[PDB]
Amino acid sequence: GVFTFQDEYTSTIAPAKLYKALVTDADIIIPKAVETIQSVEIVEGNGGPGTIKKLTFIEGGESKYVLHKIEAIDEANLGYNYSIVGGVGLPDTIEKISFETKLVEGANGGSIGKVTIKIETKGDAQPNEEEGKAAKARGDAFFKAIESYLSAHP
Numbered sequence: 001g002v003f004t005f006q007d008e009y010t011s012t013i014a015p016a017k018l019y020k021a022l023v024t025d026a027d028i029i030i031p032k033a034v035e036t037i038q039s040v041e042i043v044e045g046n047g048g049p050g051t052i053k054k055l056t057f058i059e060g061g062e063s064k065y066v067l068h069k070i071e072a073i074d075e076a077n078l079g080y081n082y083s084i085v086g087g088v089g090l091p092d093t094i095e096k097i098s099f100e101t102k103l104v105e106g107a108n109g110g111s112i113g114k115v116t117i118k119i120e121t122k123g124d125a126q127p128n129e130e131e132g133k134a135a136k137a138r139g140d141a142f143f144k145a146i147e148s149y150l151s152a153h154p
Ligand SMILES: O=C(Nc1ccccc1)Nc1ccccc1
Pocket: 019, 022, 023, 026, 055, 068, 079, 080, 101, 139, 142
């Protein structure tokens, strides 16, 4: 069975610019903007659906990574769907996790990043409350880091 979550992230950057930083130019901007992320490798595909990116980052002294597979990409509508097909975002505890994301206009010309998360867990375990909280904080940090970078580097 499926566990579904909906979260919202806010940025002062305009949706079309954010989208371009986090999708179109992600493999350049993410590592430059986010001090905790060291690299983005494209391992498969051509930036469309099917594309797999490897993001490597630091957390707790540890170098970790995640594999991001692009599920759908609707640039016209500022949409981008992905799943974690490996690394540390797909632990032994999680069978499948995907994200459906949309960037929409927020307050004062900024953005709201709308994220729908679907999770399937291994065994009868529900998604880990603690790790969900940690993941939201990491998400916030990330979007904020992107925002600081793009505020200074338009
Ligand atoms: O790549 C990421 N996001 C994104 C957002 C909008 C459009 C396309 C992609 N996010 C990401 C967030 C945290 C860790 C790793 C990746």
